[PDB]
Symmetry: D2
Subunit: 292 residues, 4 copies
Amino acid sequence: MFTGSIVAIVTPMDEKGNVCRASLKKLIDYHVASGTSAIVSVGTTGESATLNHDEHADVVMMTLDLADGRIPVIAGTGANATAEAISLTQRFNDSGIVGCLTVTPYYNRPSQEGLYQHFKAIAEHTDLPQILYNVPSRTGCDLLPETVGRLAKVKNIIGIKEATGNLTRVNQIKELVSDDFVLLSGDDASALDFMQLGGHGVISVTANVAARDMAQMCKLAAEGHFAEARVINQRLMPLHNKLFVEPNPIPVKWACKELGLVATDTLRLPMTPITDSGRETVRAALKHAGLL
Amino acid sequence: MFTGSIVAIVTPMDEKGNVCRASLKKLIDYHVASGTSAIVSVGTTGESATLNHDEHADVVMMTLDLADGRIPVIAGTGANATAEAISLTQRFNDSGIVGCLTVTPYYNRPSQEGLYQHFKAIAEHTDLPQILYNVPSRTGCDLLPETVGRLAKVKNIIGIKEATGNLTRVNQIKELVSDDFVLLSGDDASALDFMQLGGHGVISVTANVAARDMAQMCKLAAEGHFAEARVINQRLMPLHNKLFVEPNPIPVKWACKELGLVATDTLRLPMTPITDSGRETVRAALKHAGLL
Amino acid sequence: MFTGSIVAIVTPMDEKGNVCRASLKKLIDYHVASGTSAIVSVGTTGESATLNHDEHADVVMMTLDLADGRIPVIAGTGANATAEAISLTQRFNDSGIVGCLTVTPYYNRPSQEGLYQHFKAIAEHTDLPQILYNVPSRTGCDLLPETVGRLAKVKNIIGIKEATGNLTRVNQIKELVSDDFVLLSGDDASALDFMQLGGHGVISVTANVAARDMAQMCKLAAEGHFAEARVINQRLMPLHNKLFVEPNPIPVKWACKELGLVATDTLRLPMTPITDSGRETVRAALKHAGLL
Amino acid sequence: MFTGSIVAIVTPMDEKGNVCRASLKKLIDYHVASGTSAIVSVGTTGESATLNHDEHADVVMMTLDLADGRIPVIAGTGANATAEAISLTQRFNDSGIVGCLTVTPYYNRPSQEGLYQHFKAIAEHTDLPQILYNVPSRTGCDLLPETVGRLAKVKNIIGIKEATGNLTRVNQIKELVSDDFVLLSGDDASALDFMQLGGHGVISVTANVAARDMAQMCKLAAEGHFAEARVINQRLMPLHNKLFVEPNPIPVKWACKELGLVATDTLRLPMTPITDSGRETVRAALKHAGLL
Ligand SMILES: [K+]
Ligand SMILES: [K+]
Ligand SMILES: [K+]
Ligand SMILES: [K+]
């Protein structure tokens, strides 16, 4: 659903930079077995920036097909041009996906009114649940709680993936939206704290390599067993952190290859191969989490 | 050249949001008459983000046509995917443009190495001069001086539009590159200071409405007459600031419409109409500059 | 104790800028009746910066005397010179105070090792419990969790007043210290969230004017009744915020005078009298909290 | 004058942490010989924070004595309490100092109005010229250009040591004040740029060890020979940066001891000894500058 450990899955690629079906199938099975709640296909971690709209749609359909109904698929549909966002959204209108993860327009820096207008129009062109995504450090703009409250009144807008790492925002948003509105963390290092404050889950990068643990940590947190949840979080912390020792998804794709979950760690420019020291660092975090 | 006052020209649109040729023609004649050094077609102020590649190409082509050789045209060709960037550049290869303004990949946040690989690849597949564009506030990433030093070694990469507003950068970059490498300000409010420290010009938003004063100011600065350049810069300061009271190009498009330079101030979503409060602030700035 | 609503009390002054005993007595009685847990005398809010060491000591002794054992008194003992801090601490060694609130050296910006050395020496010259105080925005330096863990091993160092507003720090510090180590919020706007994450109380400014409510909010939070705690927090939020509409303690001293708790709102330079719009703002927040 | 290279001189101490006259005498003779314009006695680099008012006065007095009229002395007289500032200034009234360097109140964070009241009061109770000192990184507060414009109207306030490193400030302040108001850099790494934009000098930390190069560099800059000034600035750059590898004055005191200029590099707590890693970094910077 839109609760628990939702994975922002990587798009495994062959040596040529094209989606590798075999590796994608392995990852999906892994998530189905590990207890992951849902899969966000072609989000930032899935290299949505270097995949054209057609390739993007292909990856989503393939994932949907490989999921075979065993696990829900949420599609990344963000764009910085309102017409473009609506257009990408419409490709999935009756695809089988359960909702869309749509980011605030990046680079062009619209006003809060622009942000509002942008999401309102997208929402009016689909029946699919829309989950807002705010990540000021990559977009150059920040969706404020007041605007979220406004947008939460649109029937189709059902939640938000908050990636600021600004924990005071959980309750500022909660105070303005209904209890039905879903609050998901967008920052692994603080997801547990986010949950202890009232969040409902996390759209995770760490979950790519430690799905079992992340799912367990989230269930406990959900049941209010924060003390035992912290133990898992402590084992994972070096991963929550070192997975960004280099531009995500560079560290997570290598970790995946290393773990034997994907065939290659190939990425598309401007993402480049992990450095040697980067390898050493990630390998240690893996060791510490007990995955290696 | 790639010196002096270069206008980051707006893309005039009708009520339907489609490019308006008559207004564009008017703007071009205005710059030819005011002494503007060159025109940057379809850059950030030209709404590159909301124009599809086909519209992007048509606008650049229309501009060349309307310019009729009277003023050089530089096309915005930035993308956050290297392959997309290369393709976009190939569509302009022998169009008649003098160079390309290429922005650091936004949103995906690549490393200094990725940034290096990105631009090197683009430069390798064209013969047009490349002008790098650094604006961390909008992209989420920063092209450091040392990376600029590496890139400047590529025959094709001839300059940089620096928009951090961090003036220590002028001499940090200046010392790492060749004497003929061009440094252009990308921040109107600090452009004269930038030029006083060693820069060669400015890719201006203010030049859209104060083309003549900007051209004189830059010429005075280039000649070392900073005191007399400061006088003009003081008249223009409110505009340098107020043109950003609301998300650019919202204030400047309104200002063009107000002066009778363009028919409408219509923009594409997520850009919204100027507020009444914005109208009065920009208007007062126009009077201060002596334009209305 | 070192739990619940601890007030960073203002130092009421006559028209001449000297402590007003009558007004101080009224405030202390108010806190005793309202259920405030403890009083931090001559802290930042109490204008420790404009009071010399002798006047500082006089205010503490007077407060201690007026408290008459009905409520614990913690004394502010911070200084940016280690010898000076030790010296001020020693004046209170057998005064009757229950502990000292000592801030990280301001202005001189020592290293983490310097911070460590600084608090270790102070602690070695007293038997009084020491509560560390980290407020990077006023001091220019930041005491990191790792250093806190180091210092928490010193028997005499018993807790920390965290005023960064950085909520991820509650559990980073908790992971490194014993469960006996006290974590107090130093930021009213986020104190409840701080408590929900594991904090034990708040050294509050808001408590100066809404002591009953703050004490109640803290007890509920302590008993795990966060939902009802939020209701009180919501009523107080405009106060948590507008109390800093001007340099603290300018807004809180006026609120105090307005409420009739102190005779005058006189402050010492560089603190200046509240502005008219400042008054209007604070008066509204008071209204909203139902105090006015 | 209040032009050129002005050294923010260190306060040499023996093993016990007491002021060492012999080393001070040596430093003063060094500046007299190297061409240093003036000496700032007991400023931030001189450990004003760990010296009591009596020690502060003795050091300033010793310096005047040892200077024996061969070089002007400016005393640091800043305090975060207006009354304390006024008193400190009165102790130097007819001492022979040429002016006072007075820092914006740190820690208590006053408003622009408070800042204005503070300096006006100080200026009113002395006849010595006042040089304002803005360093937000250490004080937690910022003296804006417009407040500087107000203060500059006070006969007595003659200049500002600007240490933000924000170069747009030069002309923002320049345009608000009288032609004879002095602008001094307080940031070594950006001092030449600051001077190139209109500043008159720099109150330097690097001048402690490279007095001669700094004096020539500033004279060249004052004469408009920026190219030849840049050459020297490049040699000195590693030092401009490395002298802050560890909390100033830790690196610079070590450097003085290393050159044989001072007997010991002892500091007072919270300042701690230089680390071995620091030793090697500063040493390499000394070789680069050609001093060792
Ligand atoms: K809704
Ligand atoms: K080149
Ligand atoms: K302890
Ligand atoms: K003056």
